[PDB]
Amino acid sequence: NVPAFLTKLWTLVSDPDTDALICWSPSGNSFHVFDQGQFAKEVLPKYFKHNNMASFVRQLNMYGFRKVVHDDTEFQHPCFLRGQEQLLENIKRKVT
């Protein structure tokens, strides 16, 4: 029972067709968004029902992702990892 957000994110990051704007970091334990504006206008509304970077980022925080602090946005969750989709089962949406 893995939420759509996570399997879509995983597919989106992993897809080579989108790697110019969103791709795995070299060590495969975090991912990069490039050219936010382009990414928000062109990519997000193909996967989700919006075109707002801020809405995407909220979801990331809700699922426990943390920003990696350095137009290049990097995010990270330890059980969100290249080549290991089975680990998405351990990522939980934060309740209250």
Next chain:
Amino acid sequence: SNVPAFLTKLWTLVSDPDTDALICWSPSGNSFHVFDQGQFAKEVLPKYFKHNNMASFVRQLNMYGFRKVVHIEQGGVKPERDDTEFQHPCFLRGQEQLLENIKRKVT
């Protein structure tokens, strides 16, 4: 009109006589005081907002354009009271309709 909750809450809080020992209008009615930060933060803030941090309250004040009123110290017996004064020109005693003019800065 479409006034944010922060501002109507702040206005009501400052104006309420029940809270005047910790937060009240200045005599001229164009600024307000917070006394005893610690007690105010623990006992008052979480009844009106979703936290008990003075810093978080002050952040919202800055986001809506409020400025500190600067108290000048002098020498003395000069005992001081925990007293912070804030101010916005369209935030005034007895005149709630003016809140419409106070706008949040953009993030």
Next chain:
DNA sequence: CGGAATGGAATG
């Protein structure tokens, strides 16, 4: 104080 990261909870 204020930029920016993260959160609450109402609404979709």
Next chain:
DNA sequence: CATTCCATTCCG
């Protein structure tokens, strides 16, 4: 569960 608004927290 997702999306939005803007409030709260973190940290320089």
